[PDB]
């Protein structure tokens, strides 16, 4: 629609699509190297 | 309300006014050829409303002189009135004549002694039209030179990378450009009562040697059809003379190609109407001009209508937005830069062949008189417009 | 000083365009030719709407 | 610079080279030579006198 | 310069050319004319300085 | 690692076309292998031609489950992906 | 300031830097011996250099 | 990268540079470069794009190569419209990310 | 920044398409960028201000 009409800088900037929160993690050692 | 002025216009003043409007449009928009609309409205903060005297291009226009586009238009009109119809060899000879006189040439400097002499005309011609109508003089054939051109003007070769054709330099000047659609108002007016398929045969004959492509022919066809439509009409029928009428009439019968129909539909359902402009400095910075420029940028690429479809769609926007105000429409068309001579000259041709004669301001007539064309050229135009009102052999 | 200069230049627009057009052709001018060109285009005797807006 | 801006209708970096020069002179107008009205007359409690190029 | 000019009498342009070959420097290729911007800007600079000085 | 699936797909299509005798614009990215003029003892010849063109070795189980030129291209892209490691 | 007096060195001539076409020609010739794909649009490559 | 500092290469195996450059850090670089090129395309009279690329020399940044004409402003002119367009194009990457 | 965000917002489809193309090709040319962007319906800017 016109989601860009309701873009607010105070309350937070976010696109339409829901939070691509993909992540994975090894330990700090296997991450550094 | 709309343009009233006189009553219902006749059928001779219509034609002479179409040629006169084409003249004033080309002469007024000549110096602003090849620049964007923000640049034009920043150089002319008080509006593009008078003949410019000071031009500093590579081939400078002089005060009160038209370009090659109107030369071709009027030569088509005259030669047509001579052979009483669209006969290819006749008007092609007339065109090479208009391209020949007054000109000059330059020689070369090549190691082995290679000689590709450059002929410089006395006016401004598109490089593709220059090339094709000097290949005609180069001795070669008149019918299959487009096939040499489509593959000659292919300096684009690979154009490896390099994204937008922003530079008019990388835009496609060739068999599908605006050259054909620019000279199809007088043709479409000579055939206002002849039938659509006969009209199409005529406009196809006038194109065979330069614009064989289908989309260029479609552009020529829609502009000629608009010319004929407004020719048959009268400026007083507050129901017959409406932009929606002309646009739907175009959409149904004539518009056959895909993208042309898309642009026409887009122009149709987003069309709006400007109110009367008296202060141009305030109009050039308002919501209305901005909305119009937004639609114009939709209808083209970065404000440059090189392909015939973009050209014809832009031509209808400038004219249908000032319904009832022809001079305002030709000013708005010249204010958009790009191919301003061609766009504004076609808008003026149509405004003339619809409204007639009583709308050309006195200052533009006087400017045509005081230029280099002078009384000779001015009344040559009015006379070629008079010797067009009734010619129908074959 | 800026206001004074900008008030000088936004009266002689015709003379400035005549000068630019002349200089674009020959790429060179002498002060006497420049002076006569500017003389050919004296400033406006009165101010209309456009002149007032520019000023 | 103001002429380029009044011809084009848009700012440029040409002004960038003008005002620099002018600013130097304008300071020398106010501080060193005492032409302004900074104080009631144009006498100012601080000025920057030049050194010789011999240094 | 004058003897290459097909003449023998020194003209103003000729002594001006000599002063410039030493005061300024050697000649260089002209400004491109493919776009209006360069020559328009530089010529407007020159004609603005000249017109304001004359006024 | 990072493989350009576009080039691989183009060349797989070209190889299939040249192998069967069908024009390149007819073999669609999802056209199966029996409908394009090939039996069972001819999907193995085009497998051999694919290996010969790319100079890689096809895994065999993944070759038992090839049905669309897209999956062929994807198998080949996965093979070329894991080459140095 | 000595070798500039009349007769010794009286004429200076200026060689500019090449352009799109100049660079195109320059790179065309330095490659006659190297291995190069034939369909190289040398002009376009010189446009970005 | 100089005497020490560093922290920009991405393929050396040392404690600084991870070996395969994790995927969540490739999505971001692609989004960045895509936003920058998209804004440089729709801007009237910007330079022209010759080649967009991501991860050149394994560093964690993009690289867009711009062809420009030396005869529109002969190595000397800067107008206001051009500077504002450049500002917009340089913020586009962060904004898209 | 307001202009940058607005122009990325009204062009969401083209932005995601070009992002995918860059993710799966690594490099891309100006003609390909033009084609990808025009295939998804970009909405240009009217002026650079």
């Amino acid at each position: 629609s016109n989601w860009w009409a309701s873009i607010n800088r105070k309350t937070g900037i976010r696109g339409p699509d829901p939070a691509p929160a993909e992540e994975h993690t090894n330990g700090p050692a296997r991450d550094i190297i | 309300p709309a343009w009233r002025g006189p009553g219902e216009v006749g059928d001779e003043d219509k034609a002479v006014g179409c040629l006169l409007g084409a003249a004033v449009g080309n002469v007024l928009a000549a110096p602003y050829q090849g620049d964007r609309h923000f640049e034009v409205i920043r150089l002319r903060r008080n509006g593009v409303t008078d003949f410019w005297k000071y031009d500093i291009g590579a081939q400078p226009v002089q005060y009160g002189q038209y370009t090659g586009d109107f030369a071709n238009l009027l030569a088509v009109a005259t030669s047509l009135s001579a052979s009483r119809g669209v006969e290819p060899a006749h008007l092609l000879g007339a065109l090479t004549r208009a391209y020949a006189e007054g000109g000059s040439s330059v020689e070369v400097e090549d190691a082995s002694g290679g000689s590709s002499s450059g002929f410089l005309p006395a006016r401004r011609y598109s490089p593709y039209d220059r090339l094709v109508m000097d290949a005609v003089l180069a001795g070669t054939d008149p019918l299959k030179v487009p096939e040499l051109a489509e593959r000659y003007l292919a300096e684009t070769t690979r154009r490896h990378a390099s994204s937008s054709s922003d530079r008019p330099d990388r835009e496609p000047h060739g068999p599908s450009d605006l050259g054909a659609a620019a000279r199809a108002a007088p043709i479409g007016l000579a055939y206002r009562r002849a039938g659509g398929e006969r009209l199409l045969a005529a406009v196809r004959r006038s194109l065979e040697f330069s614009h064989p492509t289908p989309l260029g022919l479609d552009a020529a066809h829609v502009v000629a059809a608009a010319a004929a439509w407004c020719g048959r009409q009268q400026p007083g029928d507050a129901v017959g003379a409406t932009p929606a009428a002309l646009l739907s009439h175009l959409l149904n019968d004539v518009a056959v190609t895909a993208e042309q129909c898309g642009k026409l539909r887009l122009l149709r359902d987003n069309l709006f109407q400007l109110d009367e402009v008296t202060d141009w400095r305030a109009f050039y910075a308002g919501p209305q001009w901005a909305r119009l420029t937004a639609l114009f940028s939709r209808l083209s690429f970065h404000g440059l209508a090189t392909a015939g479809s973009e050209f014809a769609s832009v031509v209808l926007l400038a004219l249908l937005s000032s319904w009832g105000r022809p001079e305002q429409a030709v000013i708005v068309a010249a204010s958009l830069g790009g191919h301003a001579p061609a766009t504004a000259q076609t808008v003026g041709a149509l405004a003339g062949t619809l409204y007639g004669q009583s709308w050309v301001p006195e200052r533009w007539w006087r400017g045509l008189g005081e230029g280099v064309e002078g009384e000779a050229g001015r009344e040559a135009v009015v006379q070629a417009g008079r010797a067009l009102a009734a010619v129908e052999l074959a | 000083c800026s206001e004074d200069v900008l008030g000088i230049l936004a009266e002689r627009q015709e003379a400035m365009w005549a000068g630019i057009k002349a200089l674009s052709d020959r790429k060179e001018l002498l002060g006497s030719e420049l002076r006569d060109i500017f003389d050919a285009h004296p400033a406006a005797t009165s101010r209309d709407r456009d002149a007032r807006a520019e000023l | 610079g103001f002429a380029v801006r009044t011809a084009l209708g848009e700012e440029t970096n040409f002004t960038a080279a003008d005002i620099k020069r002018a600013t130097r002179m304008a300071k020398k107008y106010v501080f060193y030579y005492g032409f302004s009205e900074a104080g009631g007359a144009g006498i100012t409690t601080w000025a920057n006198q030049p050194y010789s190029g011999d240094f | 310069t004058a003897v290459r000019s097909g003449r023998q009498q020194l003209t103003a342009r000729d002594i001006y050319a000599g002063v410039d070959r030493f005061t300024q420097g050697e000649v260089r290729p002209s400004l491109p004319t493919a776009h209006k911007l360069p020559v328009l800007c530089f010529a407007a600079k020159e004609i603005g300085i000249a017109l304001v000085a004359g006024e | 690692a990072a493989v350009d699936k576009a080039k691989v797909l183009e060349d797989v299509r070209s190889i299939i076309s040249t192998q069967l005798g069908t024009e390149l614009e007819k073999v669609a990215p999802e056209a199966k292998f029996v409908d394009l003029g090939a039996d069972s003892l001819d999907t193995v010849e085009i497998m051999m031609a694919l290996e010969e063109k790319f100079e890689i070795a096809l895994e065999e189980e993944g070759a038992e489950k090839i049905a669309t030129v897209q999956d062929a291209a994807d198998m080949i892209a996965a093979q070329i992906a894991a080459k140095g490691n | 300031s000595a070798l500039i007096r009349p007769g010794r060195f009286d004429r200076i001539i200026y060689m500019p830097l090449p352009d799109a076409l100049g660079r195109a020609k320059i790179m065309q010739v330095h490659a006659r011996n190297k291995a190069v794909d034939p369909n190289i649009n040398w002009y376009e490559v010189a446009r970005a250099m | 990268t100089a005497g020490d500092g560093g922290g920009l290469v991405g393929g050396e195996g040392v404690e600084g540079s991870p070996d395969p450059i994790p995927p969540q850090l490739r999505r971001a670089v692609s989004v960045y470069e895509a936003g920058k090129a998209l804004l440089a395309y729709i801007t009237p009279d910007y330079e022209e794009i010759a080649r967009v690329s991501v991860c050149p020399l394994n560093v964690l940044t993009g690289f867009t190569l711009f062809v420009e004409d030396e005869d529109k402003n002969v190595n000397a002119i800067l107008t206001r419209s051009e500077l504002e367009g450049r500002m917009v194009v340089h913020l586009a990457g962060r904004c898209a990310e | 920044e307001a202009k940058a965000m607005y122009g990325l917002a009204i062009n969401w489809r083209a932005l995601q398409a070009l992002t995918q193309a860059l993710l799966d090709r690594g490099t891309i040319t100006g003609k390909e960028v033009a084609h990808i962007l025009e295939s998804n319906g970009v909405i240009h800017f009217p002026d650079p201000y």
Side-chain angles (χ1 to χ4, degrees), chain B residues 138-163:
Chain B
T140 177
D141 88 82
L143 317 190
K144 307 80 63 184
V145 44
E147 315 317 341
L148 163 142
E150 204 268 357
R151 199 205 310 119
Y152 177 83
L153 59 93
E155 35 102 332
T156 75
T157 53
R158 310 219 315 116
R159 263 174 183 343
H160 182 33
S162 301
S163 195

Side-chain angles (χ1 to χ4, degrees), chain F residues 32-47:
Chain F
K32 309 181 172 182
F33 289 76
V34 66
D35 36 319
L36 297 191
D39 44 300
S40 71
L41 225 154
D42 279 66
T43 180
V44 82
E45 275 142 336
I46 71 189
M47 289 309 108

Side-chain angles (χ1 to χ4, degrees), chain D:
Chain D
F2 288 179
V4 169
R5 187 249 256 184
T6 202
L8 232 50
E10 197 201 41
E11 288 90 315
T12 33
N13 55 343
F14 282 23
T15 306
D18 286 8
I19 68 189
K20 167 176 306 203
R21 287 227 288 126
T23 310
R24 257 192 293 270
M25 284 181 265
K27 298 194 162 146
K28 195 167 278 291
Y29 180 97
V30 179
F31 296 127
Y32 194 41
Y33 291 140
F35 297 138
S36 64
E37 228 67 14
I43 311 159
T44 257
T45 77
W46 171 95
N48 195 75
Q49 169 171 10
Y51 292 91
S52 69
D54 100 69
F55 278 127

Side-chain angles (χ1 to χ4, degrees), chain B residues 36 38-39 160-167 170 301-302, chain H residues 41-51 67 69 72:
Chain B
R36 328 295 294 243
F38 40 101
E39 291 183 12
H160 182 33
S162 301
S163 195
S164 146
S165 298
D166 233 354
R167 349 276 65 177
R170 177 182 177 108
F301 177 79
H302 266 337
Chain H
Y41 180 79
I42 62 155
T43 305
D45 262 10
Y46 203 86
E47 287 87 81
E48 311 303 89
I49 318 199
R51 180 189 145 103
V67 52
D69 50 326
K72 176 188 171 44

